[PDB]
Design an enzyme around this catalytic site. Structure first.
Site, mmCIF file in Angstrom:
data_model
loop_
_atom_site.group_PDB
_atom_site.id
_atom_site.type_symbol
_atom_site.label_atom_id
_atom_site.label_comp_id
_atom_site.label_asym_id
_atom_site.label_seq_id
_atom_site.Cartn_x
_atom_site.Cartn_y
_atom_site.Cartn_z
ATOM 1 N N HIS A 103 0.848 -1.196 0.000
ATOM 2 C CA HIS A 103 0.000 0.000 0.000
ATOM 3 C C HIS A 103 0.876 1.236 0.000
ATOM 4 O O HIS A 103 1.645 1.458 0.930
ATOM 5 C CB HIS A 103 -0.905 -0.066 1.221
ATOM 6 C CG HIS A 103 -1.845 1.090 1.311
ATOM 7 N ND1 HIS A 103 -2.881 1.289 0.404
ATOM 8 C CD2 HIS A 103 -1.948 2.070 2.230
ATOM 9 C CE1 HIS A 103 -3.558 2.374 0.777
ATOM 10 N NE2 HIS A 103 -3.007 2.877 1.871
ATOM 11 N N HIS A 138 -6.782 9.377 -0.239
ATOM 12 C CA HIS A 138 -7.396 9.262 1.079
ATOM 13 C C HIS A 138 -6.594 9.856 2.231
ATOM 14 O O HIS A 138 -7.077 9.755 3.353
ATOM 15 C CB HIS A 138 -7.827 7.791 1.332
ATOM 16 C CG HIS A 138 -6.682 6.820 1.345
ATOM 17 N ND1 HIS A 138 -6.245 6.171 0.192
ATOM 18 C CD2 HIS A 138 -5.853 6.424 2.351
ATOM 19 C CE1 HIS A 138 -5.191 5.417 0.498
ATOM 20 N NE2 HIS A 138 -4.927 5.559 1.789
ATOM 21 N N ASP A 144 0.915 5.130 -0.187
ATOM 22 C CA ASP A 144 0.174 6.391 -0.118
ATOM 23 C C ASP A 144 0.861 7.513 -0.839
ATOM 24 O O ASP A 144 2.013 7.770 -0.564
ATOM 25 C CB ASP A 144 0.096 6.794 1.355
ATOM 26 C CG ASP A 144 -0.694 5.807 2.138
ATOM 27 O OD1 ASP A 144 -1.904 5.714 1.940
ATOM 28 O OD2 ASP A 144 -0.069 5.081 2.979
ATOM 29 N N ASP A 189 1.742 -1.493 4.434
ATOM 30 C CA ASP A 189 2.140 -0.156 3.887
ATOM 31 C C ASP A 189 3.592 -0.172 3.428
ATOM 32 O O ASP A 189 4.494 -0.622 4.158
ATOM 33 C CB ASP A 189 1.943 0.921 4.951
ATOM 34 C CG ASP A 189 0.507 1.224 5.217
ATOM 35 O OD1 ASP A 189 -0.371 0.548 4.675
ATOM 36 O OD2 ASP A 189 0.302 2.196 5.989
ATOM 37 N N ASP A 246 -8.004 1.043 1.887
ATOM 38 C CA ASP A 246 -7.800 2.026 2.911
ATOM 39 C C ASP A 246 -8.747 3.216 3.050
ATOM 40 O O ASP A 246 -8.664 3.879 4.087
ATOM 41 C CB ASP A 246 -6.340 2.525 2.831
ATOM 42 C CG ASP A 246 -5.765 2.932 4.210
ATOM 43 O OD1 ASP A 246 -6.198 2.397 5.249
ATOM 44 O OD2 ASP A 246 -4.818 3.777 4.277
HETATM 45 O O1 SK3 Z 1 -3.464 6.254 4.338
HETATM 46 C C1 SK3 Z 1 -2.513 6.314 5.396
HETATM 47 C C2 SK3 Z 1 -3.172 6.467 6.764
HETATM 48 O O2 SK3 Z 1 -4.248 7.373 6.842
HETATM 49 C C3 SK3 Z 1 -3.462 5.068 7.293
HETATM 50 O O3 SK3 Z 1 -4.630 4.489 6.773
HETATM 51 C C4 SK3 Z 1 -2.166 4.384 6.888
HETATM 52 N N1 SK3 Z 1 -2.326 2.921 6.800
HETATM 53 C C5 SK3 Z 1 -2.320 2.321 8.137
HETATM 54 C C6 SK3 Z 1 -2.472 0.787 8.198
HETATM 55 C C7 SK3 Z 1 -1.319 0.016 8.270
HETATM 56 C C8 SK3 Z 1 -1.592 -1.357 8.296
HETATM 57 C C9 SK3 Z 1 -2.927 -1.766 8.236
HETATM 58 C C10 SK3 Z 1 -4.046 -0.927 8.155
HETATM 59 C C11 SK3 Z 1 -3.841 0.475 8.134
HETATM 60 C C12 SK3 Z 1 -1.709 5.013 5.568
HETATM 61 O O4 SK3 Z 1 -1.910 4.160 4.452
HETATM 62 ZN ZN ZN Z 2 -3.470 4.628 2.929
#
Ligand code: SK3
Ligand code: ZN
Ligand code: NAG
Length: 1014
Positions: A60, A441, A62, A311, A174
């Protein structure tokens, strides 16, 4: 056309009904904390029916969050992609899925040709698979559907051009809650499947118990089901490895081979992964297959999806090896041990869905139908993610301004083919990409670190400048005699004038039109109307003299009004918030009338005294202890008085009454009608002193809001023939009600200042007997019925207000339209409320590592429409949707897509013309040309122009309002040779249209057409 009002769809799961029934108890379910101890029959799978398991590696990434897009690209993503290319090339059975095309395009264009070819080969052979294929994985709460489509189209157009693929499966692990706008757009863009993850833990438990985690997601008004898209909802708390192999994270964490120590990661459940060997593979397989069979019990087929990622994973070569080799040892053992009756392998998302549908066609499962949304999300206990519906509101408003400027720039420049030297395609691509990036997001949601928010802002400012350049070159070309047109593509022929962005009191950005007997007698201005119907709208400009008159380009006088330029100041000496008037700049206001998707030119001329067709507003400052307010040449002296209630009426419109504090108290629709109580009030929410704290994501109020103490505020009343207004300086908000003859416009200049741990809310109190029902929109596309639930906490009753909300009873409706996405609710019968800003000192434990203390002044805009609806044909009580009236829809369009205003920048415009588009069809009010985009550069023999046509659905309330023209977008440009209906991204032709005619679409439908021209 399907009737979207009168037929309640029959679906297996309707989310509003589900919510009314569910108890939402948060009980400890065991190792699956929010579920139960799953049991399965070991005999279910056997020699003739094996469990097919697809382990899908993912990362993932971002596009901005804790680091900027470019920082993550340099520190992480370029390494992930370079190592994915190498490892996939070298290990033919390994697979990987990729979602964010903004990063992929950033990487690919930096690759040498040899590596570009290697990359294309691993995509073509199915090892690397793009999922969704949008520029980003967008927020689904605050995003406008037009921008969700813009970013999807930006990423998929890049994939078609460079990778020759178009994803048909979507991956959204996400976004913080999920919207049916996604399947709506995806299904009309060729998709066949989608996956979601962040849904309320109580919903996952309920759907899992009924094996309803895979469903055919249709729109709430779709009786037939043609909008349906197969959807897979993941069952567990997260998409990380501990929450994706099965119900017990203790166990699943042991199968994340990056957590043994050398990578700085560990398992919080205190049992680390262990390298798989011949001595432990049977016991490790026993544990893993048991988790898989438990997860499989929650679904209906014998095909199981096991995501494997987190991530920014798959960064180091050693990480690729540790995950791949350990899983290959597990697969070799499991697949050879007949007693498990499992066949496991790395796979892609599309491979999973293709196998599920093969099972469905074999008759092994039937899936439930579902309508509704998945807001408001809570990941645990009472931690509801309604804070991000408001966080960083300045940028949320900027999103909507840039949304419109991208549309207007693409439309204005689509009319012609441009030489490459004009750099039109270059500037539009930059603008589309910066706006698309912000749909991420952590972009529009306001959940990124402060310096990342600054990066997004700087990128959007550059995009606005790109749009202005394209727009003003286009206006010059469209309105100048052809044989006189002589462009310098770097010159500014016009500057844009925008009265609401950044806005009065936010930035002094507007240019004053300088006129004078000894310098310049007059100035041309031009208005653009991006909507496909004739439109009138008041427009205003700043001018250096009050003695200005307006004419059209046939020299016909146009009625105008001059008002002062008022600015508000927090006087740190007197400790009051009060207005100051300019003594050299004035506002001139007049009604511009502009053709559908067209342009209209006016002229402003100075005179030595009051012009015949220009009137001047009166001004009344209500406050104790007034001091003089000189206005230079303005011909009417300001009047003063002690605070008092007042009433105003512009035109034949409503009569509004205001309290002595300058806040609306009632609206009287007509001369005879009653003064309906409609009261504006400002209140504040705080933060909990013990327990979980609100932050960028979470809203955890310390109880219902408390009224803002107003003191004896200064109130300014401006009364004019064309526009009147009441403005009041309240603590943290300069609140303004503007009347032009129809529903008022409300503007709030919100400056929360240094008020830590405070959320400011604007509430409307009425006596409308709404009960527990209200309506909010989804992505500016549809209105969904909400029911306030007292079994849930206050923050769970907040929903996204991306463009509007309303309450109604049998007779009366109050609709509040917004020019920016914010959070809101109806916490009691007769109320509407919408959050203005929030300043939070604490982090909310979701990884951001900071509160929200970077607030800045923002000008929020709204329209407030009170209407009688007893004569409207509305959906029945059981229908999950609602629909706007004509006046509310036009009010929303006035906020989101106002006329654009251009000021000619030099002294004389040689060859100026008065209008463009007078022959364009004026389409029915419910139809919009959401997008007009030329798809070809000038060297293409066959030019192609794409159009996205959206028809909303407006309530029938007894107004004949008819006679309009048919709009055939394919004949808007001359020499049409073909017209095709396409997917919404313009990437696939779906129908060759007879007679080159593009039909209009049905209510609530959106279609795309491409016209080809010789
Ligand atoms: O978009 C960003 C933040 O707002 C969070 O959502 C983070 N993921 C965190 C995460 C890590 C492992 C599992 C699920 C969520 C990052 O991707
Ligand atoms: Zn994210
Ligand atoms: C793109 O993909 C299609 C389908 O696999 C293939 O036939 C075509 O040759 C590829 N490249 C071209 C020529 O566009």
């Amino acid at each position: 056309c399907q009737d979207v009002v009168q037929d309640v769809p029959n679906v297996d799961v309707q989310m509003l009904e589900l919510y009314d029934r569910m108890s939402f108890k948060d009980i400890d379910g065991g190792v699956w904390k929010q579920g139960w101890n799953i049991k399965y029959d070991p005999l279910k799978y056997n020699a003739h029916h094996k469990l097919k398991v697809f382990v899908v590696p993912h990362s993932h990434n971002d596009p901005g969050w804790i680091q900027t897009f470019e920082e993550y690209y340099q520190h992480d993503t370029k390494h992930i992609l370079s190592n994915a290319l190498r490892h996939l090339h070298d290990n033919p059975e390994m697979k990987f899925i990729w979602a964010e095309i903004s990063y992929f395009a950033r990487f690919y264009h930096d690759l040498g040709e040899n590596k570009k070819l290697q990359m294309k080969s691993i995509v073509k052979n199915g090892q690397l698979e793009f999922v969704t294929g949008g520029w980003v994985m967008p927020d689904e709460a605050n995003s406008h559907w037009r921008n969700v489509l813009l970013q999807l189209t930006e990423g998929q157009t890049w994939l078609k051009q460079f990778m020759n693929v178009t994803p048909t499966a979507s991956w959204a692990i996400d976004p913080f809650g999920h919207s049916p706008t996604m399947p709506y757009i995806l299904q009309k863009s060729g998709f066949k499947n989608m996956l979601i993850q962040r849904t309320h833990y109580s919903v996952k438990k309920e759907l899992a118990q009924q094996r309803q985690l895979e469903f055919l997601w249709r729109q709430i008004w779709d009786n037939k089901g043609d909008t349906a898209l197969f959807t897979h909802m993941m069952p567990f708390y997260s998409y990380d490895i501990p929450h994706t192999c099965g119900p017990d994270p203790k166990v699943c964490c042991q199968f994340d081979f990056k957590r043994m120590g050398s990578f700085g990661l560990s398992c919080p459940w205190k049992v680390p992964p262990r390298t798989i060997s011949d001595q432990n593979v049977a016991a490790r397989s026993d544990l893993l297959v048991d988790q898989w069979k438990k997860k499989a019990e929650l679904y209906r087929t014998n095909v199981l999806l096991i995501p494997l990622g987190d991530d920014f994973r798959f960064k180091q070569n050693t990480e690729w090896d540790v995950q791949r080799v350990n899983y290959e040892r597990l697969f070799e053992h499991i697949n050879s041990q007949a007693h498990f009756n499992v066949q496991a392998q790395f796979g892609t998302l599309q491979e999973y869905f293709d196998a599920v549908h093969q099972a469905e066609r074999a008759g092994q499962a039937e899936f439930p139908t579902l309508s509704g949304d998945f807001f408001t999300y809570a990941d645990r206990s009472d931690n509801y993610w309604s804070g991000y519906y408001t966080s960083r509101p300045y940028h949320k408003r900027m999103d909507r301004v840039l949304m419109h400027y991208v549309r207007a720039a693409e439309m204005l420049s689509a009319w012609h083919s441009w030489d490459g030297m004009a750099r039109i395609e270059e500037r539009l691509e930059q603008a589309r990409r910066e706006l698309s990036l912000f749909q991420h997001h952590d972009g529009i949601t306001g959940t990124a670190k402060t310096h990342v928010v600054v990066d997004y802002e700087q990128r959007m400012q550059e995009a606005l400048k790109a749009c202005q350049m394209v727009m003003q070159q286009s206006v010059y070309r469209l309105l100048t005699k052809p044989s006189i047109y002589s462009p310098d593509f770097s010159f500014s022929y016009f500057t844009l004038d925008d009265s609401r962005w950044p806005g009065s009191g936010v930035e002094d950005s507007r240019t004053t039109i300088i006129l004078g007997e000894d310098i310049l007698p007059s100035k041309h201005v031009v208005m653009h109307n991006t909507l496909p119907h004739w439109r009138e709208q008041l427009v205003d400009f700043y001018v250096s003299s009050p003695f200005v008159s307006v004419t059209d380009l046939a020299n016909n006088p146009v009625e105008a009004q001059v008002s002062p330029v008022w600015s508000w100041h927090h006087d740190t000496l007197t400790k009051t918030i009060h207005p100051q008037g300019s003594t050299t700049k004035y506002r001139i206001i007049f009604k511009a009338r502009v053709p559908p998707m067209g342009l209209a030119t006016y002229v402003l001329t100075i005179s030595d005294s009051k012009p015949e067709h220009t009137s001047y507003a009166s001004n009344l400052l209500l406050r104790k202890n007034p001091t003089s307010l000189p206005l230079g040449q303005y011909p009417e002296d300001v009047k003063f008085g002690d605070p008092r209630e007042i009433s105003l009426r512009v035109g034949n419109g409503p009569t509004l009454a205001f309290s002595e504090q300058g806040l609306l108290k009632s609206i009287q629709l007509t001369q005879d009608s009653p003064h309906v109580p409609v009261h504006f009030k400002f209140l504040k929410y705080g933060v909990r002193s013990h327990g979980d704290r609100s932050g960028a994501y979470l809203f955890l109020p310390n109880g219902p809001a408390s009224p803002v103490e107003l003191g004896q505020p200064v109130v300014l009343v401006t009364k004019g023939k064309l526009e009147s207004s009441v403005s009041v300086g309240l603590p943290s908000v300069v609140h303004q009600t503007i009347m032009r003859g129809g529903a008022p416009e409300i503007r709030n200049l919100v400056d929360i200042g240094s008020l830590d741990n405070t959320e400011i809310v604007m509430r409307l109190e009425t006596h409308i007997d709404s009960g527990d029902i209200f309506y909010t929109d989804l992505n500016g596309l549809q209105f969904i019925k909400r029911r306030r639930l007292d079994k849930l906490p206050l923050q769970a009753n907040y929903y996204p207000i991306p463009s509007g909300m309303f309450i109604e009873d049998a007779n009366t409706r109050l609709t509040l339209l917004t020019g920016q996405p914010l959070g809101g609710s109806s916490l009691a019968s007769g109320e509407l409320e919408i959050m203005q800003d929030r300043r939070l000192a604490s982090d909310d434990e979701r990884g951001l590592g900071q509160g929200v203390l970077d607030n800045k002044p923002v000008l929020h805009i709204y329209r407030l429409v009170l209407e009688k609806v007893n004569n409207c044909v509305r959906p029945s009580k059981l229908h999950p949707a609602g629909y706007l009236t004509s006046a509310a829809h036009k009010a929303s369009q006035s906020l989101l897509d106002p006329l654009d205003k251009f000021i000619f920048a030099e002294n004389e415009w040689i060859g100026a013309q008065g209008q463009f588009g007078g022959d364009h069809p004026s389409a029915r009010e419910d139809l919009d040309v959401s997008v007009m985009r030329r798809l070809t550069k000038s060297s293409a023999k066959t030019q192609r122009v794409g159009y996205v046509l959206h028809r909303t659905n407006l309530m029938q309330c007894g107004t004949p309002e008819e006679h309009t023209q048919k709009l055939d977008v394919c004949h808007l440009l001359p020499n049409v040779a073909r017209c095709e209906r396409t997917t919404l991204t313009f990437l696939q032709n779906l129908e060759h249209l007879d007679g080159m005619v593009a039909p209009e679409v049905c209510p609530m439908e959106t279609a795309a057409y491409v016209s080809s021209h010789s």
